[PDB]
């Protein structure tokens, strides 16, 4: 399965002009388009090689869409001030994510159309693509409004139609790169500590897509040892990195195994020091 997702942010800056409005689009973990209202001559712009050959009509249509959305989000930010009885002097953020998860046979697995205000859930289209989940009393105003307007119908039509159709085209355009499942290359490093014990660190490098699970285990028992798991991070070349550590007694290193699961692996990896 694959995903097409757009991430939209407006941030007000009272006293410094109109809000900054931005969009970024992704296929799976690969960015491919951007918009930034603060750029000189703002236009929708390519950020992956396999989108650069969409014709001029594509960029004109997406730029027009972004500039209409920008006006919408200006209105939304002003309305949020009224809903929350907030002063006109503060900076606030409105975020929006929309997109589709699609199986390789074209089946829509899940559609998303959801918002956050000042970094917290505001309103979200439910998995049925028919009803809304509102996070507070302000969002209940929006829910009533969009229910009476039938807003979800148009949203669902995008998620079941346009989103699915264009994801298919993008995967065709970028089939030389987007379909890969590069498995992690893994190893364990060993670091004696001054305290007399040992840090074992299990590394996973060079993998795509970004989803991965790294786990330290013994022989089924729950590990009470001190552990640490860093956030998955981009290498910058289209692959990702992660590590996971455990502090173990000196002389007991061989009791611990690191287990690695990833879409690109035919079998999960098990590694020891």
């Amino acid at each position: 399965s694959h995903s097409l997702r757009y991430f939209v942010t407006a941030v007000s800056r009272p006293g410094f002009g109109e809000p900054r409005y931005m969009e970024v689009g992704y296929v799976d973990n690969t960015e491919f388009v951007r918009f930034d209202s603060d750029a000189e001559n703002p236009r929708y712009e390519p950020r992956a090689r396999w989108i650069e050959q969409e014709g001029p009509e594509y960029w004109e249509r997406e730029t027009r869409r972004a500039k209409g959305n920008e006006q919408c989000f200006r209105v939304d930010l002003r309305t949020a001030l009224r809903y929350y009885n907030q002063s006109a002097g503060g900076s606030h953020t409105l975020q929006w994510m929309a997109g589709c998860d699609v199986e390789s046979d074209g089946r829509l697995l899940r559609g998303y159309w959801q918002f956050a205000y000042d970094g917290c859930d505001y309103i979200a289209l439910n998995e049925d693509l028919k009803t809304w989940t509102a996070a507070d009393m302000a969002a209940q105003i929006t829910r009533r409004k969009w229910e009476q307007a039938g807003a979800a119908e148009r949203d669902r039509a995008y998620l079941e139609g346009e989103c699915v159709e264009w994801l298919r085209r993008y995967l065709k355009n970028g089939n030389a790169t987007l379909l890969r499942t590069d498995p992690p290359k893994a190893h364990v490093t060993h670091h004696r500590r001054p305290e007399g014990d040992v840090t074992l660190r299990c590394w996973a490098l060079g993998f795509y897509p970004a989803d991965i699970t790294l786990t330290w285990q013994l022989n089924g028992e729950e590990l009470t040892q001190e552990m640490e798991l860093v956030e998955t991070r981009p290498a910058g070349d289209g692959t990702f990195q992660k590590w996971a550590s455990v502090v173990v007694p000196l002389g007991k290193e061989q009791k611990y195994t690191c287990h690695v699961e990833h879409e690109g692996l035919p079998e999960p990896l098990t590694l020891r020091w």
Binding site: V8, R61, R65, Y83, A98
Partner: peptide, 10 residues
């Protein structure tokens, strides 16, 4: 292609 607000506001 991306989603359009279609001037549906909160």
């Amino acid at each position: 292609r991306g989603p359009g607000c279609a001037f549906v506001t909160i």
